[PDB]
């Protein structure tokens, strides 16, 4: 018996109990999310502890199989995934300290509150008040005050713990045969041992920088247009050549620019295409929406939903009888138990969210043939890319007219197309340079290039150089601004959004070549097209058994990532932006507010 047979036997013996414990943990999490009770919390905690102990034991016992004597890629990848001990390789004291720091940062981020200066007892919380002020308010004082309060809450009282957290993560990465935590996160992008499909961590950075440099003109024109539009709404505040303030970006951190659509719409004289009123008049419900989505997914050649899905998914808010959380997320309990938890209502946003969740469930069912150690997409961005392209295909006017929501005599003009493209640019493209800058700053912090006392200075310098956001209030080195981010304070990646955006654009460029379509790219619809459905299913069923480069080339025909699909998609908007900025200043000056 060779080493390969022993490794296969170990994997076959381990995957059964792995799937069993994963299903147990998923059922515990579902019972916790559907009914918040002490018993459910205790059961979920016990299941998580058992799962962590099982993972630690399996990672400790899996060290007996060498990686140099494995000729099969499917077994080698699973062995490499099992050998990674994760956070369980550190000592007890260091692990307890890291967990305490994580819990402290989570409690600080969750308990973020903004109080009035006149009344210290009168305070508010993030979601209902701060988002409403930053999104649906036109007052310069209230928004700036709320932003300054939120920036002062998370800050100097968190950096002494954040630095120790970074040090512990670097030690953990060095313990797992990595140079730093950045290389540990980029380990999923590295591919070795494949003829003509190798990939390095530096190649990813080079490709991201090249895509950013190619998008730079479009983002510059978009920023110039947003500045010219906001200059009239806020006189004597928006600089004509300087950067834009952070509190007027329509977001607490400047991530999304969708909230500025109410003030930057070019053709607001006519309402945008919305099927909410149609569903209200027709008295539809979540069941009809899910049935239409199922018919749409079946019409392209994908298998229909299982019976347990319709018999176990909570597609309707139960009310006060159950303490359910209205947070739409994909649930994959395993062994054919696919569920969806979402409080779907009669709205277009909920329609797109339900389509995204059904696309995620279809992907999970697609890569379900692979073992438990490979039950995942080719990368951390394939799921969101598939969901977004499915939502875009469903949001097409032809599909809306076919499903009976729009009248057959409905027409579309260029103004609606320009408005839709501007909305999509503010929603997706608005967060790309910020994502790039945040990821580069975090990578440089992990590399140790900025050791002690140049974090905030270089952070704001790169921010004004890339995104172009001027400081509305003088800061210093103690105010750790990146620590207030959701993904940074909770140890989550941020470049995954850029990767899924690239994958979405590449899939939109690729799949629309086979399906019959005439006109622009945003009107592409893959409904009733079995060819594109089969071409997509040939890649969705691959899972993690093959590198992401081969799976991407099997769809777009390219061995590397590309950004030209985004330019071809936004060319109708880019031309209008050039025509509007022809008589306006282009660019932004980094010299403003000499504090």
């Amino acid at each position: 018996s060779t080493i390969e047979e022993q490794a296969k036997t170990f994997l076959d013996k381990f995957n059964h109990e792995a799937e069993d414990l994963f299903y147990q943990s998923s059922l515990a999490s579902w019972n916790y999310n559907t009914n918040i009770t002490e018993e459910n919390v205790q059961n979920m905690n016990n299941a998580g502890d058992k799962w962590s102990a099982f993972l630690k034991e399996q990672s400790t016992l899996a060290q007996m199989y060498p990686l140099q004597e494995i000729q099969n890629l499917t077994v080698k990848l699973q062995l490499q995934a099992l050998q990674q001990n994760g956070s369980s390789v550190l000592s007890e004291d260091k692990s307890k300290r890291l967990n305490t720091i994580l819990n402290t940062m989570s409690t600080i981020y969750s308990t973020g509150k903004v109080c009035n200066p006149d009344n210290p007892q009168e305070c508010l919380l993030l979601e209902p008040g701060l988002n409403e002020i930053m999104a649906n308010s036109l007052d310069y004082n209230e928004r700036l005050w709320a932003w300054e309060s939120w920036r002062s809450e998370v800050g100097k009282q968190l950096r002494p713990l954040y630095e120790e957290y970074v040090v512990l993560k670097n030690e953990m990465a060095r313990a797992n045969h990595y140079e730093d935590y950045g290389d540990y996160w980029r380990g999923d992008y590295e591919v070795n041992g494949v003829d003509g499909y190798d990939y390095s961590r530096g190649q990813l950075i080079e490709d991201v920088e090249h895509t950013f440099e190619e998008i730079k003109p479009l983002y510059e024109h978009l920023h110039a247009y947003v500045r010219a539009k906001l200059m009239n709404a806020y006189p004597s505040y928006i600089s004509p050549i300087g950067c834009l303030p952070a509190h007027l970006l329509g977001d607490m951190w400047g991530r999304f620019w969708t909230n500025l659509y109410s003030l930057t719409v070019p053709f607001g004289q006519k309402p945008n295409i919305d099927v909410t009123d149609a569903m209200v008049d027709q008295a539809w419900d979540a069941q009809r929406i899910f049935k239409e989505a199922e018919k749409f997914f079946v019409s392209v050649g994908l298998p229909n939903m299982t019976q347990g899905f319709w018999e176990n998914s909570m597609l309707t808010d139960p009310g006060n009888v159950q303490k359910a959380v209205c947070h739409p997320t994909a649930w994959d309990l395993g062994k054919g138990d696919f569920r969806i938890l979402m409080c779907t209502k009669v709205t277009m946003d909920d329609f797109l969210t339900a389509h995204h969740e059904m696309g995620h469930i279809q992907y999970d069912m697609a890569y379900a043939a692979q073992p438990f150690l490979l039950r995942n997409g080719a990368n951390e961005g394939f799921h969101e890319a598939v969901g977004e392209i499915m939502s875009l295909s469903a949001a097409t006017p032809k599909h809306l007219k076919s499903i009976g929501l729009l009248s057959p005599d409905f027409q579309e003009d260029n103004e609606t197309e320009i408005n839709f493209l501007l909305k999509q640019a503010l929603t997706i493209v608005g967060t790309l340079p910020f994502t790039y800058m945040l990821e580069k700053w975090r990578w440089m912090v992990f590399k140790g290039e900025i050791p002690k006392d140049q974090w905030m200075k270089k952070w704001w310098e790169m921010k004004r150089e890339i995104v172009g956001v001027v400081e509305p209030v003088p800061h210093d080195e103690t105010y750790c601004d990146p620590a207030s981010l959701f993904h940074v304070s909770n140890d989550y990646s941020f470049i995954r959004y850029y990767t899924r955006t690239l994958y979405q654009f590449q899939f939109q460029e690729a799949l629309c070549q086979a399906a019959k379509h005439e006109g622009p790219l945003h009107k592409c619809d893959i409904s009733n097209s079995t060819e594109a459905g089969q071409k997509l299913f040939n890649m969705l069923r691959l899972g993690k058994s093959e590198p992401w480069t081969l799976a991407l080339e099997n769809v777009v025909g390219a061995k590397n990532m590309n950004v030209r699909p985004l330019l071809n998609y936004f060319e109708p908007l880019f031309t209008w932006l050039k025509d509007q900025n022809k008589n306006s200043f282009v660019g932004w000056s980094t010299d403003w507010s000499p504090y």
């Binding site: 013996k13 059922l27 007996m64 347990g308």
Partner: protein, 97 residues
């Protein structure tokens, strides 16, 4: 071969561990052969003396649950084997009168 779904018969809450299956053995089984051996499968050259490296239990439990998918529900399978040995045919089908 006769098989039918038994989801409402063989399923049990918190997993029905009453059913097991053999996934590891030294060699393939001959047709019409039965073996209920519970010896630990030796996957290496080292002598097997207990649970540990290169020594895994060959029997695994299903754990049927009612919330599983259609592919994981318990299915009772009955295979009818007919013998045509040199002997009087004592078994026959029904005859209508």
């Amino acid at each position: 071969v006769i098989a039918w779904n038994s989801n409402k018969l063989d399923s049990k809450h918190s997993g029905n561990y009453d059913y097991w299956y053999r996934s590891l053995r030294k060699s393939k089984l001959k047709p019409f052969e039965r073996d209920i051996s519970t010896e630990i499968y030796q996957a290496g050259n080292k002598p097997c003396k207990g649970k540990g490296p290169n020594c895994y239990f060959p029997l695994q439990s299903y754990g049927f649950r009612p919330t599983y998918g259609v592919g994981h529900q318990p299915y009772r399978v009955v295979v009818l084997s007919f013998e045509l040995l040199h002997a009087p045919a004592t078994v026959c089908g029904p005859k209508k009168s």
